[PDB]
Amino acid sequence: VNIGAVLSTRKHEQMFREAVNQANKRIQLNATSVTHKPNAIQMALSVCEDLISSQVYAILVSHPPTPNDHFTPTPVSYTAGFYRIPVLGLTTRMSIYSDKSIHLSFLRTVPPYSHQSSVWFEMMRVYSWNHIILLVSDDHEGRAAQKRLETLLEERESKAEKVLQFDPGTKNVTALLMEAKELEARVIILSASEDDAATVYRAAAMLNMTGSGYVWLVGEREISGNALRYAPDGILGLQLINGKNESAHISDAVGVVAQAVHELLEKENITDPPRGCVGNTNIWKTGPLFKRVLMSSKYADGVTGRVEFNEDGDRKFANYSIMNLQNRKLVQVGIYNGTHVIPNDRKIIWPGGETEKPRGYQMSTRLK
Amino acid sequence: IGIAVILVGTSDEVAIKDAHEKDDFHHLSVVPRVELVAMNETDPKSIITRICDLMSDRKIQGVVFADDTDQEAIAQILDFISAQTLTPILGIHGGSSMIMADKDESSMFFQFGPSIEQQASVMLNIMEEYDWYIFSIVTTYFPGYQDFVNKIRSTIENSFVGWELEEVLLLDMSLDDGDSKIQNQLKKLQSPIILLYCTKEEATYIFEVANSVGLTGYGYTWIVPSLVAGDTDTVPAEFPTGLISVSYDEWDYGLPARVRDGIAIITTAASDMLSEHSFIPEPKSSCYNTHEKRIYQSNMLNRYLINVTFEGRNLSFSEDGYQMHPKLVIILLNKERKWERVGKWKDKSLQMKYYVWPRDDHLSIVTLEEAPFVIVESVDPLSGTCMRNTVPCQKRIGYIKKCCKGFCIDILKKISKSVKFTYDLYLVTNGKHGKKINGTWNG
Amino acid sequence: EEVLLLDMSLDDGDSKIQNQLKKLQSPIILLYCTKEEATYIFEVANSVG
Amino acid sequence: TVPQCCYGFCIDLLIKLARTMNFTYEVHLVADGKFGTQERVNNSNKKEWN
Ligand SMILES: *[C@@H]1O[C@H](CO)[C@@H](O)[C@H](O)[C@H]1NC(C)=O
Ligand SMILES: *[C@@H]1O[C@H](CO)[C@@H](O)[C@H](O)[C@H]1NC(C)=O
Ligand SMILES: *[C@@H]1O[C@H](CO)[C@@H](O)[C@H](O)[C@H]1NC(C)=O
Ligand SMILES: *[C@@H]1O[C@H](CO)[C@@H](O)[C@H](O)[C@H]1NC(C)=O
Numbered sequence: 001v002n003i004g005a006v007l008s009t010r011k012h013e014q015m016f017r018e019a020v021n022q023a024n025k026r027i028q029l030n031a032t033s034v035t036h037k038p039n040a041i042q043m044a045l046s047v048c049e050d051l052i053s054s055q056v057y058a059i060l061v062s063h064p065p066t067p068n069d070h071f072t073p074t075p076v077s078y079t080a081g082f083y084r085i086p087v088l089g090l091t092t093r094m095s096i097y098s099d100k101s102i103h104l105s106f107l108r109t110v111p112p113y114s115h116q117s118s119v120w121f122e123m124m125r126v127y128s129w130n131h132i133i134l135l136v137s138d139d140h141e142g143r144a145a146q147k148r149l150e151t152l153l154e155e156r157e158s159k160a161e162k163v164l165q166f167d168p169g170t171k172n173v174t175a176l177l178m179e180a181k182e183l184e185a186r187v188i189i190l191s192a193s194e195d196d197a198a199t200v201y202r203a204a205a206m207l208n209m210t211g212s213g214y215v216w217l218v219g220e221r222e223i224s225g226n227a228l229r230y231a232p233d234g235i236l237g238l239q240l241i242n243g244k245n246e247s248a249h250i251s252d253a254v255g256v257v258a259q260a261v262h263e264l265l266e267k268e269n270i271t272d273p274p275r276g277c278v279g280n281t282n283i284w285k286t287g288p289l290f291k292r293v294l295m296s297s298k299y300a301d302g303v304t305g306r307v308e309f310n311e312d313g314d315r316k317f318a319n320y321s322i323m324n325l326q327n328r329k330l331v332q333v334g335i336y337n338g339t340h341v342i343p344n345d346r347k348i349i350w351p352g353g354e355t356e357k358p359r360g361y362q363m364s365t366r367l368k
Numbered sequence: 369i370g371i372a373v374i375l376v377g378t379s380d381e382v383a384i385k386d387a388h389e390k391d392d393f394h395h396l397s398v399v400p401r402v403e404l405v406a407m408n409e410t411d412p413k414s415i416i417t418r419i420c421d422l423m424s425d426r427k428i429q430g431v432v433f434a435d436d437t438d439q440e441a442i443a444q445i446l447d448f449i450s451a452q453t454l455t456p457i458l459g460i461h462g463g464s465s466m467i468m469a470d471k472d473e474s475s476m477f478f479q480f481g482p483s484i485e486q487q488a489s490v491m492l493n494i495m496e497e498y499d500w501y502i503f504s505i506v507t508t509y510f511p512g513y514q515d516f517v518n519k520i521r522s523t524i525e526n527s528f529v530g531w532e533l534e535e536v537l538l539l540d541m542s543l544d545d546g547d548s549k550i551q552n553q554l555k556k557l558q559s560p561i562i563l564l565y566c567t568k569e570e571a572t573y574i575f576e577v578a579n580s581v582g583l584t585g586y587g588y589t590w591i592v593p594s595l596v597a598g599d600t601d602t603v604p605a606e607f608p609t610g611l612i613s614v615s616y617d618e619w620d621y622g623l624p625a626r627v628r629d630g631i632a633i634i635t636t637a638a639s640d641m642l643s644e645h646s647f648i649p650e651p652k653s654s655c656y657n658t659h660e661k662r663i664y665q666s667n668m669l670n671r672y673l674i675n676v677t678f679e680g681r682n683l684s685f686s687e688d689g690y691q692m693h694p695k696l697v698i699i700l701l702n703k704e705r706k707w708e709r710v711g712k713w714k715d716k717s718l719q720m721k722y723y724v725w726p727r728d729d730h731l732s733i734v735t736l737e738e739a740p741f742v743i744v745e746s747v748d749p750l751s752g753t754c755m756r757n758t759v760p761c762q763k764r765i766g767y768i769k770k771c772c773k774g775f776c777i778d779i780l781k782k783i784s785k786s787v788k789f790t791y792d793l794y795l796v797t798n799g800k801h802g803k804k805i806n807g808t809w810n811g
Numbered sequence: 812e813e814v815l816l817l818d819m820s821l822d823d824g825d826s827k828i829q830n831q832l833k834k835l836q837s838p839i840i841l842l843y844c845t846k847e848e849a850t851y852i853f854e855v856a857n858s859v860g
Numbered sequence: 861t862v863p864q865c866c867y868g869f870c871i872d873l874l875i876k877l878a879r880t881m882n883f884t885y886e887v888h889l890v891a892d893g894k895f896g897t898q899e900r901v902n903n904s905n906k907k908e909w910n
Contacts, residue, residue: 039656040452044412044416045413074448074472078445078448101469102470147514277413278413
């Protein structure tokens with residue numbers, strides 16, 4: 001009747017316990033938390049031991065310092081998927097945990113990075129932009145973002161002018177920039193890691209690729225750290241409202257788990273989860289039902305707003321903030337409330353310093 | 369080198385190990401060793417502990433895995449272990465054998481099995497064999513459907529054959545309230561072939577809905593990948609009779625054969641590493657906290673594991689983890705809810721044992737070669753099949769397509785169109801026209 | 812083109828009704844039955860399309 | 861790529877079209893010297909024009 005938590009600090013575990021206790025007053029279930037470990041194998045062994053010690057209906061996972069999302073929550077999800085025990089992620093947007101083929105019984109509290117592609121659609125309709133180019137990286141995240149953008153564009157019968165890809169970690173992207181320079185398109189959309197984004201920023205503004213026109217659109221990882229340090233003025237980045245916050249995510253996760261447990265308690269034929277990985281090898285026989293109950297659960301009102309789960313177990317109806325870099329600063333110029341984008345009363349600058357939105361399309365008069 | 373072979377649950381006996389001793393591997397310079405380990409737990413903690421004990425206590429570098437259950441989490445756990453331990457792991461005959469896409473980077477985990485693209489290519493070859501150029505596509509919101517559709521469309525576009533590809537469906541199936549929507553969009557499948565792609569649980573519901581609509585019958589054929597079939601002996605009382613599926617070779621492939629193949633692959637990779645770039649023939653084992661394993665430089669060894677000949681077998685793998693030249697079989701749902709092997713798929717070939725594809729208005733016709741009446745040409749070298757004014761023509765003695773034509777052929781075509789009947793032309797073997805010899809006819 | 816009988820007395824061949832009904836390619840159908848049988852036939856035809 | 865001179869009916873039509881709608885041009889000859897048809901490549905069986 002208890003739930004498991006894997007946080008990154010003792011304070012986080014105490015906060016989770018306090019939140020679960022508070023939600024209890026609104027059964028005798030009590031919380032259980034385990035800290036992270038440097039070794040992935042050690043983390044898997046610890047999670048297995050915790051599961052064996054007491055039956056767990058749901059497991060929450062967080063991100064410690066030096067996240068390395070590619071392998072931080074992966075062991076927990078892999079261990080929990082054997083018995084089909086739902087696992088909720090607190091701060092993870094790698095987009096690899098969305099496919100049910102690999103990660104089974106997984107839920108998200110924050111939208112993945114790929115969903116940012118949707119954010120680059122209202123700006124495509126409110127600014128009258130039709131010719132764009134993509135600098136997506138060559139990896140799962142970049143492929144997912146490109147696929148989502150192409151699917152969104154195909155609805156209106158207008159796809160990207162040219163989609164280019166670059167191997168991750170490359171130190172020479174001059175060829176791609178030169179190829180994309182003569183394309184009669186001024187809107188540039190980038191989707192890469194911090195180091196890759198910083199590398200692309202260098203050797204790009206060198207060939208007058210910044211200034212007049214040349215609207216730049218990026219996500220959230222691009223404007224951060226080294227990439228942000230080298231980011232040119234007029235960059236239109238996206239920021240998550242409550243992505244950094246952890247206590248709020250814990251509170252909403254606890255509330256949703258409690259609501260799902262209360263809803264499931266009414267139903268009959270509720271088989272108890274196995275009391276130990278060793279010996280037990282059959283499926284829970286109720287994991288799919290608990291996952292279905294957890295999904296499609298319209299939470300009344302959480303600290304981070306309305307809680308909705310997508311068909312892939314991802315966060316639904318999120319809120320983004322549009323940031324425009326200017327004078328080595330960052331200011332908010334609009335808010336995307338999941339379905340639409342509303343600008344604020346602040347002026348929007350452009351890479352060329354103009355006060356009017358560039359057309360973003362330069363037709364060529366020299367024909368071959 | 370020491371390769372550990374792990375068997376879980378019911379398996380063979382130590383006799384298989386004998387095949388690992390009296391073989392070309394022993395005579396090779398690799399001089400490998402085998403330490404068979406049998407387990408009956410099949411749990412993540414148990415598997416991890418066994419792997420760690422084998423790696424630490426014993427000096428080994430390669431692992432061959434073979435389970436008995438159908439749990440797919442075993443493959444993911446093996447991939448995770450390989451990524452962490454930085455040691456090659458081969459999964460065969462079980463959950464580890466199930467093909468999983470999007471493997472973790474720097475993970476040297478391989479398994480026996482085909483990909484979605486290979487199954488789509490096999491389906492297209494089967495369709496082209498019997499001249500089924502009109503079909504549709506039905507899929508659901510399941511991972512891999514995009515790759516399936518893209519492969520089908522790419523194959524159709526880059527070909528000189530005349531395909532149809534009338535309609536393609538999505539079948540959300542996620543909204544419970546939209547139950548009638550599935551039936552509404554299912555009334556557009558006039559094409560004979562369907563080529564469904566979905567999970568077994570969704571497959572049963574889709575089949576029931578189609579039967580309610582009336583898409584299951586003598587005039588409609590369904591082809592599905594191995595995912596829909598699942599367990600061969602677990603027909604859910606709803607699959608229409610005559611369903612065609614593509615599966616991996618599970619009958620003419622023994623567990624000892626797979627173990628020998630894995631041992632040979634590992635030994636050949638080790639020998640190739642020793643011969644070329646002999647700086648480090650085989651890195652030593654390790655333990656927990658493998659961060660100091662960068663000295664091993666397994667990247668060089670990884671490129672060698674994707675090239676194995678084995679006395680003319682081409683056991684090379686792919687950069688993803690699936691073998692490039694697998695063995696595939698075509699199964700058909702018999703009348704008494706059974707699956708029978710109809711044909712096998714070689715590297716680039718097809719050995720279907722049915723030349724007519726047996727199931728009222730369908731009769732056979734015999735023709736003879738004549739100068740102005742029945743001219744027997746050959747298939748078109750450009751597209752591989754005949755074209756306008758020509759019809760398929762069998763040739764007994766096993767057969768060979770000829771695509772006959774001529775005046776009598778045109779008359780037969782017009783007569784068939786007028787009377788609305790189907791046929792299958794074939795040439796005669798003995799006797800030209802017919803004469804009573806010893807009271808018996810011929811030709 | 813063709814004529815049908817649609818013997819509704821034997822419901823065991825109900826699956827056949829949807830089968831033989833998916834053959835009338837002609838626009839005009841010229842149905843003839845009772846009101847209840849007419850409603851049943853119309854529902855089956857709508858399901859078939 | 862020898863820079864030869866070219867003229868004729870097509871050149872006159874191109875000059876008139878360029879004069880009508882303001883745009884410059886850069887004429888060059890086709891490499892294989894063929895109008896174009898769909899053919900098959902020996903490797904990869906990639907159907908393409910020429
Ligand atoms: C309370 O939490 C602790 C975790 O330290 C756990 O061992 C114990 O089983 C929990 N109590 C109940 C009744 O589950
Ligand atoms: C996180 O959210 C909580 C609300 O529960 C708030 O009190 C806290 O200040 C937030 N932290 C940051 C860094 O915004
Ligand atoms: C988002 O804001 C727009 C303002 O134009 C409003 O029409 C829409 O209903 C809002 N949607 C949500 C989910 O708040
Ligand atoms: C081309 O000529 C037109 C006159 O019809 C003029 O309006 C336009 O500016 C010219 N374009 C140039 C000079 O690039």
